[model samples]
Target: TLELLQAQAQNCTACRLMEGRTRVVFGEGNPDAKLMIVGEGPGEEEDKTGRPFVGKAGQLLNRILEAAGIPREEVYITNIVKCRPPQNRAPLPDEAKICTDKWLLKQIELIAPQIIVPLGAVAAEFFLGEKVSITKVRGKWYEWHGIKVFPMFHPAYLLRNPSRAPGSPKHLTWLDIQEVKRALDALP
Candidate 1:
């Protein structure tokens, strides 16, 4: 899987993001994982590392998974866009549109996870096939393409709005994590 994605990403001039990126952060983890977590895109640190979610946000994600009793390596994790959007900004619609078909869907098809967890509005929107307010729909479950998808706020957003809700994203993410744990346990 990595080999195929690497080959595609190496010469991937599919989107404008390819112009300034240092490397394409594909993804890593158990290929047979029952759950797959997808984020928006690579950041400066992740671009340099060639690994997904290795920055501060990644650290928070690590804790979130740990709290849910899910080993970081037990589940596959990746980003919607392999390349970092210039300056770590949100990926543009055109950029995401091109990569969704070219890369993201291919990755999902390979993983074929029972639960697809998208972390942030961009990723959730793309996977859900519609525009949605992450705040309203996040931490909730939806069925798409015969897989269960749960949307969650970006860790970066939680960092900014830590106290926005009494039981904020961090707290809600804990709840979401438990749900994932339960589902994983129940899977055949």
Candidate 2:
């Protein structure tokens, strides 16, 4: 059960991330969701709230989902690492590596989402097993462990770039979300 897994993750000390974190931000959402969203790690608000994607990035993510016509509650959401890094920096490779198999992989095994959406370069790299530019990978599909994975720009990146002009990050993200919605609809 996801609750049991979440409880086990709360006690995880598999990495140094355990030392600095206030709380383990285990995933939250429908267990039966066909779509699962993964982010790099928790930020300030998320670490404090023990919830995934509850920060400014989360607010934008909610808007993106709304634009895509997918209700946030209808899908599962989580981060690569359940803990926050210092100063909200990206999770170190070592930190991510340990957490991947320890928790995230298990989460994926249980959820069995048909489509996994990686919401940034870090999450994308972890899943894709290579360091690639988000611009090069976004809006494309890759298969991992028999599940389809779609990479998308992090909401934080969109926040930083913030232009809805035809070719902008926000505009591209909108297109990507629409594609995700269509894909979800086409799923069995």
Candidate 3:
């Protein structure tokens, strides 16, 4: 399975991003993981390391997961698009279109995770197949492809706005994590 995923990832040219990327950030963690966390894409640090979520935002994300009682290595982690967007901007529609069908879906099929947690608007929009605001729908569970899904604000967003009062996205995410924990524990 690893070899097949590697081959497909390496040869991916369905999008323009393949042109400038240092390497494809396919995914990492236990292949048999019951949980999957999908982030937006590689950033400068990730581009250098050929890994996803290795930057400041990633460091905070590690803390978030540990706080929620799930170790980083116990869940599969990857990006919506393997390649970093030029200038670290949100991905263009064309780039996501090519990536979702070509790579993300294939990875989903291979992992078959019981719960999927999308870590931002872009990642949530892709998996949900709709464009709902992450803040509005976050903390609520949805089902896609027979797997449970939860959307939460990206760690980068939290860093930008650290206030955690009522109506804050960070607080919402905290609630969402607790909900996900309950759901995960209830899974048969």
The candidate that wins on TM-score is 2
User: For candidate 1, lDDT tens digit of each residue in 11-54?
Assistant: 78888999889888878898878999999998878999888888
Per-residue lDDT over 1-188 for candidate 2, one digit per residue giving the tens place of the 0 to 100 score: 88999998889899888888998999999898899999989998998989998899999999999998999999999988999988888999898889987888888988889999999899999778888888999999999989999999999998899987898999899999999999999997
TM-score of each: 0.94, 0.97, 0.93
Put the candidates in lDDT order, highest first: 2, 1, 3
lDDT of 3 by residue, 77-171 (tens): 88888888888888888888788777788788888899999989998887688887877767778889889998889988898888978978678
Angstrom error at residue 30, model 2: 0.8
Clashing pairs in 2: none
Model 1: residue 11 alpha-carbon error in angstroms: 3.0
What are the runs in model 1 whose C-alpha is more than 4 Å off? none
- CA lDDT, every prediction? 0.86, 0.92, 0.84
Better of 1 and 2 by lDDT: 2
Q: How many steric clashes does model 1 contain?
A: 0
Ranking by TM-score: 2, 1, 3
| TM-score computed on alpha carbons, candidate 2 | 0.97
Clashing pairs in 3: none
